[PDB]
Amino acid sequence: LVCNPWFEHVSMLVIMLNCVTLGMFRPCEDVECGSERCNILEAFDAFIFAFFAVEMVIKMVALGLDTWNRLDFFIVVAGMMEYSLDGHNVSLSAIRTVRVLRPLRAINRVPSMRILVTLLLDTLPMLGNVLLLCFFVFFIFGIVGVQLWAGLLRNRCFLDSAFVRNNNLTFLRPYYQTEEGEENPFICSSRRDNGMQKCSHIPGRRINWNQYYNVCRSGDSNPHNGAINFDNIGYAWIAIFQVITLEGWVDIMYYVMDAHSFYNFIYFILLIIVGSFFMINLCLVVIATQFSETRIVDSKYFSRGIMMAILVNTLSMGVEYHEQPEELTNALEISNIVFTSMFALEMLLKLLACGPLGYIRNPYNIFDGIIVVISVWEIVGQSVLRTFRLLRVLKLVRFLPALRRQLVVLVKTMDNVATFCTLLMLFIFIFSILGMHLFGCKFSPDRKNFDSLLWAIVTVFQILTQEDWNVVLYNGMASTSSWAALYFVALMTFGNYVLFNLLVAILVEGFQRFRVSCQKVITHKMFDHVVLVFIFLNCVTIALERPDIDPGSTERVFLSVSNYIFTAIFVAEMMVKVVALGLLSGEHAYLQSSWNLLDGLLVLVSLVDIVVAMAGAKILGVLRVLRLLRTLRPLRVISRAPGLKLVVETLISSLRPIGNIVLICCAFFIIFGILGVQLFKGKFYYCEGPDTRNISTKAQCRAAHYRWVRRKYNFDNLGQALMSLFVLSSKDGWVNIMYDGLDAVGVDQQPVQNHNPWMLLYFISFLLIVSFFVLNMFVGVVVENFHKCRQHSPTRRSIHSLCTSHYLDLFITFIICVNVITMSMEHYNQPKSLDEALKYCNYVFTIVFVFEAALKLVAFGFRRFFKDRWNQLDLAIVLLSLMGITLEEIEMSAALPINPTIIRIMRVLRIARVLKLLKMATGMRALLDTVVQALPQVGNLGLLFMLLFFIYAALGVELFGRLECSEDNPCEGLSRHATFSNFGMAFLTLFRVSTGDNWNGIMKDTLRECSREDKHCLSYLPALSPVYFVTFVLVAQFVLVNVVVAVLMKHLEES
Ligand SMILES: CCCCCCCCCCCCCCC(=O)OC[C@H](COP(=O)(O)OCCN)OC(=O)CCCCCCCCCCCCCC
Ligand SMILES: CC(C)CCC[C@@H](C)[C@H]1CC[C@H]2[C@@H]3CC=C4C[C@@H](OC(=O)CCC(=O)O)CC[C@]4(C)[C@H]3CC[C@]12C
Ligand SMILES: CC(C)CCC[C@@H](C)[C@H]1CC[C@H]2[C@@H]3CC=C4C[C@@H](OC(=O)CCC(=O)O)CC[C@]4(C)[C@H]3CC[C@]12C
Ligand SMILES: CC(C)CCC[C@@H](C)[C@H]1CC[C@H]2[C@@H]3CC=C4C[C@@H](OC(=O)CCC(=O)O)CC[C@]4(C)[C@H]3CC[C@]12C
Ligand SMILES: CC(C)CCC[C@@H](C)[C@H]1CC[C@H]2[C@@H]3CC=C4C[C@@H](OC(=O)CCC(=O)O)CC[C@]4(C)[C@H]3CC[C@]12C
Ligand SMILES: N#Cc1ccc(Cn2ccc(NC(=O)Cc3ccc(C4(C(F)(F)F)CC4)cc3)n2)nc1
Ligand SMILES: [Ca+2]
């Protein structure tokens, strides 16, 4: 019965049988319960539920009155309720959702997956300190958000009530809305605010009604069918949660910049730094520590000949592109024959030298043999075996022992990844079925739908990548209810929790006479400090450059002369140093260090700039190239600051251990790049027009007077494929590239939705494989740091007793906690009754804190009380609170000598009372202290991070400073808020690119061709744009990785 293993094996079979029936659910074909197919499936379910009841009875009888056993009971009890409740039509459908817990029974049946889930549950209790930090971020920013922006996103430009009445016309729509509709609302700034969007910015008619929408007042709905707003703490947390995921966070920012103030970016910068970066990466640090505590053939020249023969053949496959000349196609086929014969000859020579049994004795010769026959089969059989010619690159592993040793290391990591993958596939399946029940056939149909198991799994997988997940959120919120946000919050929170544990698992298994004067000047202690001043001043000059400076303005003269002065200063510095040290003769010569070589090249470029500028000559093309090299001057700061020099040298040395993983990843990119070109070249064209459902070919598009256009990210050649693959790997806009590959039909054919669903394998295989390599690169950097780190008064006494006792602290904690609850009840258009109640509560809290200060003064004495920092903090809040009440009362009275701006700030600043709770949080303070101890390392990397922004911010203004956006030339990433028009705006744009939020949209705007009528075009900008964004994205993320490592190592050593 229970003491035999076969009974469990029977239980496992039935558990798997349920998973099949659950996946067969059809949301809008099974809910009506009409089809015979549904009838048998429910019969199947009834059969299985009967066994699950029997299994309990036998086990209950055999053991009598373990978490997993309790789970078995809970599932059946709920199942019995649903099963027995049949007959009552009230909420019967809403009760069938309990069937999705059944696959959880497979956890206990599989031993390995049982042990893993035990560790996951045992690690949870030690995340309480991080969870407490999460509450502080959400509540501090949640309250600040509501008090600032409550009800502002309902603003719309309305018609005047008198205007519509007196003119006796009501055909106009009440408020201005774009032709698109309410999905692109025009949020205006009220009269009592200074938002960036006013009703005077409405475009004119394209018979002048748009100029009569001149009153800005609250509307009826918020953006996205009411999903995005700050009307109460409940909605402010959804906006804060979406920002922390870095998905569509700029859009939320732009809404409040239009409605409230431009300086609201400070709110979203701190939230991303504090909430997105530190608070999410502290989860990884805490788990990481906790988990740790818990005669001719054999010749070298012959081998080299084959090695280069394979390499040329593999690269020759990348010369394919869309419109190949037929002679080029033939050359590739002739080339295939030559290389095919060469490998065939090789097998013959080796077979004779060792014989068939000797030849088979080595696995690699077997692998090489199989390729030859398939390749020969292809020639004799003259598109299925053309794709298999990509396997020829795998032969290079034999000749690359260093790379071969890395491949086995990665493979050994996949033994413990498989355990987590099995848990994640079960995790995805449960949420895919759960979504089908909640949102099945209700997103009326969007491609991101839960209408079937295939696209429910794809949608759930997409949310885990955090790509357009907010689009799915708004659909779920609008269709069923606003509480549907908990489906996505639990899916993301639980999914990222499991993926951190996979990263930690790999880490732990990884741990297991004039010349005399010059010599004196350069050796002077103040030499670097003096030159560092001039370098800093040059930065101010570079940052003032922008395209809108008039050639004849005074500023242009100021900037132009400063260039002559600065170039003169930095040649003298080089000349003085060169004379002192010598150019290259002596051992201490000038060119014996790279940091000196860099300085010389910058000086050389500056001199050439003067020479060219001195030319009244056809040197316009060369001049623009020199302007780009003038933005690298700020690189001279690194050598002058010893802190920067050390960190910069540390990052370079960190790339050595992961050099081979990068090579394997780069080889992977080319292999998949070539494969994509063969599949998708010439098929990413489409017809662009208002009514295109009737078009099916290029010819019909021309007839309908539409335009036949190509996607920005395509696979027309290996150059275009590599750009597309990088956008996939970054997981920003990777769904749109996938859709194009799914819809591809052929050359000159209109793409059709979901034409080839089998292409999901191509795009989802690249995402997983590239993510695996990037996972092992992070582990490679950490392990290296670990290895190198380890190698290296009768009445007064009674009051004094009370203050010393813990009773006062517990009382204070209660008072602040209730003050926390009352601060969350504020919302837009709250009743006046609640206003008075909240105001009265403020009086009680202020009085309590005043008594709190008085008693401590009595107990400890004036100076001794003041010594404690916490006591100082207590005084500030009491003092701060007293002024807030005073300004509130006087303003509420007849006299009005105060600005409603000051009253708002004092109202907002009462959020500081939460800091009194930080005193009780001893565990949280220790967690914060770990970061505070890493500042010397994190501080220097921050300077490198801010230097990286300066160089690319100044380089962006030069390249993309003149791009325009208009209805004639629409743009997808750039807007009124995202531009490179000046250094100040380029800095904000790169911060968005740093977080990866629709950075692929910005790149598109730089790849789109120049107008035939416009001037100041740059013909090869499309070639330079991919380099600009690719390098910044890789470099910006790598620096942040080294910040995470610096904190991680300190937390390990600190224990
Ligand atoms: C650390 C704190 C938690 C962080 C988790 C972040 C994600 C939070 C998302 C949960 C909030 C979802 C509810 C949003 C809300 O309050 O407003 C919706 C609701 C209106 O719903 P209708 O669609 O019917 O609107 C039509 C109106 N006739 O608004 C309300 O009625 C307000 C009731 C709730 C007040 C806000 C407090 C909610 C408590 C949230 C706790 C969630 C914890 C999750 C960890
Ligand atoms: C060494 C660096 C880090 C010093 C600090 C950076 C400054 C040089 C930046 C920060 C703010 C920037 C300013 C922000 C806004 C403007 C307004 C704008 O000037 C205009 O002509 C107004 C717009 C218009 O013409 O309609 C663009 C330049 C300027 C002065 C920017 C010039 C460069 C500034 C001063
Ligand atoms: C080779 C690996 C190791 C490194 C990556 C190098 C790539 C960036 C190179 C290799 C092959 C190159 C391609 C070789 C041939 C062509 C065809 C050439 O065709 C045309 O000019 C298009 C004519 C037309 O169809 O109208 C355009 C450049 C392109 C795609 C090249 C772009 C740059 C590529 C992809
Ligand atoms: C390997 C990963 C990390 C990506 C590395 C950066 C690539 C995205 C860069 C490197 C070289 C770039 C290419 C260099 C030259 C050009 C110019 C131009 O080439 C063409 O002529 C193709 C278009 C045509 O057929 O007209 C268009 C962009 C392209 C292919 C670039 C596209 C982006 C590329 C592939
Ligand atoms: C302290 C933390 C753990 C939150 C829980 C405390 C509750 C006592 C507070 C938090 C937010 C408050 C809500 C904030 C906003 C609103 C909306 C307000 O107006 C509406 O019903 C608006 C309906 C809509 O437009 O969706 C009614 C009171 C209510 C539910 C409040 C009731 C009291 C709530 C739930
Ligand atoms: N100032 C500033 C600033 C602040 C925040 C932002 C946006 N951002 C948030 C986070 C972030 N990067 C990082 O955490 C660095 C990192 C990248 C990948 C990993 C992985 C995995 F865990 F992901 F798999 C193991 C491979 C770990 C660490 N960037 N941008 C600029
Ligand atoms: Ca995105």
Swiss-Prot record:
Mod. after translation = In response to raising of intracellular calcium, the T-type channels are activated by CaM-kinase II.
Residues crossing the lipid bilayer are: 6-24, 47-65, 67-81, 91-109, 130-150, 264-288, 301-321, 335-356, 363-381, 385-408, 420-440, 484-508, 522-544, 563-583, 594-613, 625-646, 657-680, 758-783, 806-826, 841-862, 870-888, 903-926, 941-961, 1025-1052
- Give the result of residue 777 to I, as annotated: In HALD4; changed calcium channel activity; increased aldosterone production in response to potassium ion stimulation; increased expression of genes involved in aldosterone biosynthesis, with the strongest effect observed on CYP11B2 expression in response to potassium ion stimulation
II repeat ranges are 295-511
Q: Where is this site: Calcium ion selectivity and permeability?
A: 247, 467, 732, 997
Q: How does the record describe its quaternary structure?
A: Interacts (via N-terminal cytoplasmic domain) with STAC.
Q: What is this protein's record name?
A: Voltage-dependent T-type calcium channel subunit alpha-1H
- Interval of the full protein contained in this chain: 96 to 1866 of 2353
